[PDB]
Design a protein around this ligand. Sequence first.
Ligand SMILES: [Mg+2]
Ligand SMILES: [Mg+2]
Ligand SMILES: [Zn+2]
Ligand SMILES: [Zn+2]
Ligand SMILES: [Zn+2]
Ligand SMILES: [Zn+2]
Lengths: 162, 162
Amino acid sequence: ALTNAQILAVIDSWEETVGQFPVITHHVPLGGGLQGTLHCYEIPLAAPYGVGFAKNGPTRWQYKRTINQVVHRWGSHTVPFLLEPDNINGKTCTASHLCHNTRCHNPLHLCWESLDDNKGRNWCPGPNGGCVHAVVCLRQGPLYGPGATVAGPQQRGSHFVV
Amino acid sequence: ALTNAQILAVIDSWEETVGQFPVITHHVPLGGGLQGTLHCYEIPLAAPYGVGFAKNGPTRWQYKRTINQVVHRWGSHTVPFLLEPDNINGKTCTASHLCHNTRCHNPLHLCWESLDDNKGRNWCPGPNGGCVHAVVCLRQGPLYGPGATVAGPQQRGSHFVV
DNA sequence: TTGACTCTCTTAAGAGAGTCA
DNA sequence: TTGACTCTCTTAAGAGAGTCA
Ligand SMILES: [Mg+2]
Ligand SMILES: [Mg+2]
Ligand SMILES: [Zn+2]
Ligand SMILES: [Zn+2]
Ligand SMILES: [Zn+2]
Ligand SMILES: [Zn+2]
């Protein structure tokens, strides 16, 4: 098994490589009608991506290192959290983009939480609009808002009460 | 089926059958520290479910009627919305439980909206806690809250800024 | 050891359709 | 005609693993 020192070395090499990804400045809603800025470190759209990186899906990547002749591979956004518990409350921990930018690998834009917590950030009002996430959102979720509901609750007769 | 009259007849038959489902009172968080009461019309746990109804999955059902000597079948919660557009902004419309109770078929607890709008209600603060859904929530979403994030954003070196 | 591809899987909000009696 | 089962699929937030040179 990999030692703590070996895991730390993996995290350090990952950070070195991601730190050379193009850094893109994005203006984003924070909630409360305020605008802020996030700096995303974006993996390239096509190969080559960077040392150790390869694309396994349209917006999925993996990081691979060979240590003492053994090939180790991780989801590309999971590497910052290799020294953390991998489950909580019986749920698997997932890498969760606070910037809602899949290609971004900035570890200051990632957290490690259940898939439900992860998804829910899509609808958060944001750090200046009422976010209650204990690990605070960096921005208003992209799907926050009144929605586009086509038809509301309704009945033709009188069989129901709310 | 094809005619508006035939579709109205389907909705009316569905409402009459669901109106005979057991009415179960559920006390629910509204947001803002307030509580309300919903009356769900719950499909039975096992067969028989009601005229026209059959279970296709653990919490999936379908309603079927014979019209023009042919069988017409629909998702069991889609029947109230058969006269509505089946898409919005190029996204499929889905039956969406405002009561977050799958077995419930009360059309006063259903709306018709994109799967993204549907999902997002799980995290809504609720009608007394800041819901901004244009078709308003009936309760605070069951997943609303601080979350249980295991690890927040972090870096080991000095390669990144937020 | 490494890059660049390939494949399928998980979850929890939702779906369509076939086999029998 | 109606009932009671069976199967796989969709989506968008996420995953694991194989092949070849
Ligand atoms: Mg996310
Ligand atoms: Mg729902
Ligand atoms: Zn980012
Ligand atoms: Zn938040
Ligand atoms: Zn209900
Ligand atoms: Zn709401």
